[PDB]
Amino acid sequence: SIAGNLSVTVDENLMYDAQDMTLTAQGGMKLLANAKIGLKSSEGVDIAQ
Amino acid sequence: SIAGNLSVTVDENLMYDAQDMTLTAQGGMKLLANAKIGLKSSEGVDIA
Amino acid sequence: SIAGNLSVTVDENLMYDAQDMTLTAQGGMKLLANAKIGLKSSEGVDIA
Amino acid sequence: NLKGQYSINVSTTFPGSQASLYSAIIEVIASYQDDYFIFELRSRQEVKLNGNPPSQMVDLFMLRLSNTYYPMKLKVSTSGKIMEVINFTDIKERWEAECAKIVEEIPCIAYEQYIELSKSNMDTENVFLQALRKDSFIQFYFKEYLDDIDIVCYNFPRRGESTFYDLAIDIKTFHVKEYNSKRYSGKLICEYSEENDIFSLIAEFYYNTGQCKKKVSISVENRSVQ
Amino acid sequence: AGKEFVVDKAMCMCKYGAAPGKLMVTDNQFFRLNGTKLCASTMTLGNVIYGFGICKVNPMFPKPCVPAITQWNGQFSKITMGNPLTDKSKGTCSCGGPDCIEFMQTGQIPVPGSKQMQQATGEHQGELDAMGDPSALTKHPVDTPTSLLLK
Amino acid sequence: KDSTKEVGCGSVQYEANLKFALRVKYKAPKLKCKGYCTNAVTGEYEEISKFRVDENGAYTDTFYCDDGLQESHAGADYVFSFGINNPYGFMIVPSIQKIHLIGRNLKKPQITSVIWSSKEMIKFGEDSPRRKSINYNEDGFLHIHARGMYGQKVRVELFEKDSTGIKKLLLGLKDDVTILDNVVCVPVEMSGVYAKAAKGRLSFEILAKVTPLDTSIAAFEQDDKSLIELQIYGKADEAAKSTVNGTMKFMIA
Numbered sequence: 001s002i003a004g005n006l007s008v009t010v011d012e013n014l015m016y017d018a019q020d021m022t023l024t025a026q027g028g029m030k031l032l033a034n035a036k037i038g039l040k041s042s043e044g045v046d047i048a049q
Numbered sequence: 050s051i052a053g054n055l056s057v058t059v060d061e062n063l064m065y066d067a068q069d070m071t072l073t074a075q076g077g078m079k080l081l082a083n084a085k086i087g088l089k090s091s092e093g094v095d096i097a
Numbered sequence: 098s099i100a101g102n103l104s105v106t107v108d109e110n111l112m113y114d115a116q117d118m119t120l121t122a123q124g125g126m127k128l129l130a131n132a133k134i135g136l137k138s139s140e141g142v143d144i145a
Numbered sequence: 146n147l148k149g150q151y152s153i154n155v156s157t158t159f160p161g162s163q164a165s166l167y168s169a170i171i172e173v174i175a176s177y178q179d180d181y182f183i184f185e186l187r188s189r190q191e192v193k194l195n196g197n198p199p200s201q202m203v204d205l206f207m208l209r210l211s212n213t214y215y216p217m218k219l220k221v222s223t224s225g226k227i228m229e230v231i232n233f234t235d236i237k238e239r240w241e242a243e244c245a246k247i248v249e250e251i252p253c254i255a256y257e258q259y260i261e262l263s264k265s266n267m268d269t270e271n272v273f274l275q276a277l278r279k280d281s282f283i284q285f286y287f288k289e290y291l292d293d294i295d296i297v298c299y300n301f302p303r304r305g306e307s308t309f310y311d312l313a314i315d316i317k318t319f320h321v322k323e324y325n326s327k328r329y330s331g332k333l334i335c336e337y338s339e340e341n342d343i344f345s346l347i348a349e350f351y352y353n354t355g356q357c358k359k360k361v362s363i364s365v366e367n368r369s370v371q
Numbered sequence: 372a373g374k375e376f377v378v379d380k381a382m383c384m385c386k387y388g389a390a391p392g393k394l395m396v397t398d399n400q401f402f403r404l405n406g407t408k409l410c411a412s413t414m415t416l417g418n419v420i421y422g423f424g425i426c427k428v429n430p431m432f433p434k435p436c437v438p439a440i441t442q443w444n445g446q447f448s449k450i451t452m453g454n455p456l457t458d459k460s461k462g463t464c465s466c467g468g469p470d471c472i473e474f475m476q477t478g479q480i481p482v483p484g485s486k487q488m489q490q491a492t493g494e495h496q497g498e499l500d501a502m503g504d505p506s507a508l509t510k511h512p513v514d515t516p517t518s519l520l521l522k
Numbered sequence: 523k524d525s526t527k528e529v530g531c532g533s534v535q536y537e538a539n540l541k542f543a544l545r546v547k548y549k550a551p552k553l554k555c556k557g558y559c560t561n562a563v564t565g566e567y568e569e570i571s572k573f574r575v576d577e578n579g580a581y582t583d584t585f586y587c588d589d590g591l592q593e594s595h596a597g598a599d600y601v602f603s604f605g606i607n608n609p610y611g612f613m614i615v616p617s618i619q620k621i622h623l624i625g626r627n628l629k630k631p632q633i634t635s636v637i638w639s640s641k642e643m644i645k646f647g648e649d650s651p652r653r654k655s656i657n658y659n660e661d662g663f664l665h666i667h668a669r670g671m672y673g674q675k676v677r678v679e680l681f682e683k684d685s686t687g688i689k690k691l692l693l694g695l696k697d698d699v700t701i702l703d704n705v706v707c708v709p710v711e712m713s714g715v716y717a718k719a720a721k722g723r724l725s726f727e728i729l730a731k732v733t734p735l736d737t738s739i740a741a742f743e744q745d746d747k748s749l750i751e752l753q754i755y756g757k758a759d760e761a762a763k764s765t766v767n768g769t770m771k772f773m774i775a
């Protein structure tokens with residue numbers, strides 16, 4: 001439970017692996033990159049609506 | 050590595066700075082946000 | 098701050114909370130899942 | 146000299162899950178034409194899964210691939226023994242053209258692997274006839290019920306495992322044999338028309354390991370005898 | 372504003388044109404939806420079919436329906452990518468006015484996979500496809516046509 | 523009771539592609555046989571679904587597998603079940619046959635070939651069409667054909683060969699692949715190897731190295747006869763890629 005800003009810096013590949021993910025953010029999420037942002041699924045991707 | 054479940058809560062802002070980011074979900078991903086979900090690639094954005 | 102490869106493995110579900118999430122990758126970002134990837138943005142999604 | 150439409154229903158109940166139902170209407174126009182008897186298996190319509198038309202892409206792909214067999218020209222001898230399928234080369238060429246057009250439309254490795262795996266089944270007429278038994282209607286309608294019969298439930302316990310049931314002597318009702326009675330159970334009832342022409346048949350089989358169950362029911366709906 | 376999104380080479384029908392056409396997107400060259408299919412936004416304006424056969428605003432004086440779409444109505448406003456189109460979207464073509472264009476298909480083809488191969492009702496596969504190896508419905512399909520002759 | 527003469531009872535080791543027979547003991551009752559093989563990736567037994575008993579004539583105590591067990595399945599454990607009823611699925615055993623497959627006239631299991639193929643589809647017994655030029659956008663297919671190795675865990679690592687003829691470890695996969703039926707296709711995301719080789723430094727001469735986890739079997743190193751060439755200045759148009767998982771959709775929900 002970080003009270004201040006949490007900053008993680010990796011100078012090489014970063015790999016997460018989990019059964020289920022929930023990246024809930026009380027604000028704005030900025031997933032910016034320099035190559036293809038390859039969202040992929042075996043069941044499809046939905047939207048908020 | 051974690052054997053149970055990972056639960057990280059940040060009161061303030063979160064910044065991750067990596068080179069080759071990749072998250073793998075064996076079930077389903079649930080990206081929830083309150084303001085907006087930016088997706089900038091400067092090369093190309095794919096969704097499925 | 099990690100100068101090598103940050104690899105985190107969770108057997109169960111992963112929960113992340115934040116105020117203003119920001120993930121940046123100088124290479125390629127990849128999101129993988131086996132179920133639907135939910136984008137539940139309250140206001141909307143931005144793509145550039 | 147006879148024809149009609151037969152309703153075929155298959156209900157497979159797995160342990161800890163709801164029943165899965167496949168229902169179809171087979172338009173079959175038999176013809177005496179010696180021991181020759183051509184049935185021609187004219188068409189298969191109203192294919193329903195769990196009471197609803199199929200919607201998954203893989204089930205639709207399987208139906209598209211299997212629509213090439215209909216119409217067959219199965220050479221039933223006297224009671225159901227299919228000696229051969231004379232309309233095989235035409236079926237083979239139709240299925241090859243269908244496979245080519247699905248490959249061109251969707252170059253998917255899953256569909257391609259399915260095609261190669263079925264190629265061995267359809268390579269030879271004898272192999273095609275042997276693998277034709279997997280259909281419930283073909284297995285239960287083209288079968289001699291001589292008081293001692295055997296039926297293969299092709300995915301009875303799980304997907305990809307068969308199970309052999311031997312039925313006893315005892316409107317031509319049978320019953321499952323005595324060995325391993327605590328695991329194998331069920332019955333088979335068959336009711337004929339005035340002259341052969343199987344009118345109804347209900348066969349229930351039970352794998353007691355909860356209790357995997359499979360009930361096959363064939364019924365005559367719009368028959369016509371000349 | 373619907374249940375899906377419109378991508379490149381999507382089915383498209385104009386109530387004035389003779390034959391249905393195929394959508395063409397060229398402004399958006401970075402955002403893709405289903406594999407390598409570029410998404411269609413409200414910025415896809417003008418000649419976006421390589422046409423709809425022959426235009427029929429005046430039946431006595433027909434001409435090839437070169438599209439001149441100047442407005443898209445029915446977009447999804449929750450993605451500021453311009454906003455993506457939807458199966459309910461309709462164009463203008465500058466010939467038949469609004470609601471002159473219609474989307475027969477969204478242009479997305481759901482190519483299956485190993486998970487979809489497993490999700491199939493394989494217990495009824497012997498009825499759905501008799502010439503079919505159940506191992507093709509597993510994650511790793513291996514061809515084992517082993518025969519045991521009786522001679 | 524493996525036959526080919528008449529061999530005694532018990533589990534046996536047989537070479538692939540040999541006409542043999544099975545015998546049973548206790549007129550001509552109804553024998554109902556079943557076939558089981560080990561799943562390559564799981565390692566556990568599974569029924570051979572496309573198992574047919576051709577009826578050339580009346581039933582006999584001996585079953586003839588004249589086609590010979592498949593060379594592609596050299597290294598598997600075929601199992602035959604018999605009986606007057608639903609055959610067993612294997613400890614109550616009196617009527618059961620266990621055969622271990624080995625290569626036909628093959629001294630030891632080995633990697634017979636590794637190539638950079640253009641088509642993702644792969645099958646044992648044929649030379650897959652290999653490619654020479656690929657781009658960073660495309661996804662390469664590495665086709666590994668082995669002899670006598672069925673369902674074998676194997677690591678594969680990608681080397682790069684420079685103008686000086688030195689092969690240096692460029693990349694490696696996080697997971698070990700499984701040779702399924704003496705053949706396997708590995709989809710390699712080629713963008714990673716590019717990024718890495720651009721970090722390390724015309725065209726990029728990418729070679730492959732296949733090492734089984736078993737100590738006895740040697741390793742296969744790719745050479746000039748099969749090495750792929752990454753174009754430093756180029757891109758696919760839309761790009762040979764993998765379709766194992768497929769592209770489903772982007773819907774609204």
Ligand SMILES: [Zn+2]
Nearest residue numbers: 426436464466
């Ligand atoms: Zn027009």
